[PDB]
Amino acid sequence: EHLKREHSLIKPYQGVGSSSMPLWDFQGSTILTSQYVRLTPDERSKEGSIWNHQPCFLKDWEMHVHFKVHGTGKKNLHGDGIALWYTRDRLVPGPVFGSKDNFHGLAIFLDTYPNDETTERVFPYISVMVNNGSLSYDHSKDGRWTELAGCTADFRNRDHDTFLAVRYSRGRLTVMTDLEDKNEWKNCIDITGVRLPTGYYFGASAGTGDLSDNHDIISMKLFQLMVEHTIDWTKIEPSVNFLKS
Ligand SMILES: [Ca+2]
Ligand SMILES: [Cl-]
Ligand SMILES: [Cl-]
52 Cβ neighbours under 8 A, 6+ residues apart: 7, 23, 24, 90, 201, 202, 203
Q: Is 131 annotated as a binding residue?
A: no
Q: Is 95 annotated as a binding residue?
A: no
In angstroms, rounded to a whole number, what is the distance separating the alpha carbons of residues 220 and 214?
17
> Is residue 30 helix, strand or coil?
coil
Distance from Cα 64 to the centre of ligand 1, integer Å: 23
155 Cβ neighbours under 8 A, 6+ residues apart: 67, 69, 110, 124, 126, 162, 164, 177, 179
What is the DSSP code (8-state) at residue 17?
A: S
Q: Is 80 annotated as a binding residue?
A: yes
Distance of CA 65 to the CA centre of its chain: 8
Distance from Cα 69 to the centre of ligand 3, integer Å: 12
Residues, CB-to-ion distance under 5 Å, ligand 3: 158-159
In Å, how far are 118, 156, 164, 206, 234 from 159, measured between CA atoms? 31, 9, 16, 21, 42
User: CA torsion sign, 194 to 200 to 108 to 210?
Assistant: negative
Q: Is 179 annotated as a binding residue?
A: no
Q: Is 157 annotated as a binding residue?
A: no
Q: Report phi then psi at 202, rounded to 5.
A: -80, 140
Q: Are 50 and 28 in contact (CB under 8 A)?
A: no
Q: Is 113 annotated as a binding residue?
A: yes
Task: Using the CB atoms, write b or e for 123-138: b if 16+ within 10 Å.
Answer: bbbbbbbbbeeeeebe
In angstroms, rounded to a whole number, what is the distance separating the alpha carbons of residues 199 and 242?
24
90-97: which pairs have CB atoms within 8 A and are 24 or more residues apart?
A: 90/25, 90/51, 90/52, 90/201, 90/203, 91/25, 91/27, 91/49, 91/51, 93/27, 93/28, 93/47, 93/49, 93/205, 94/47, 95/137, 95/139, 95/207, 96/137, 96/205, 96/207, 97/205, 97/206, 97/207
Q: Are 214 and 73 in contact (CB under 8 A)?
A: no
**For domain 21-245, which CATH number applies: 3.30.2320.50, 2.60.120.200, 3.40.50.620, 1.10.3720.10?**
2.60.120.200
Domain boundaries in the chain? 21-245
Distance from Cα 126 to the centre of ligand 1, integer Å: 10
Distance from Cα 160 to the centre of ligand 3, integer Å: 6
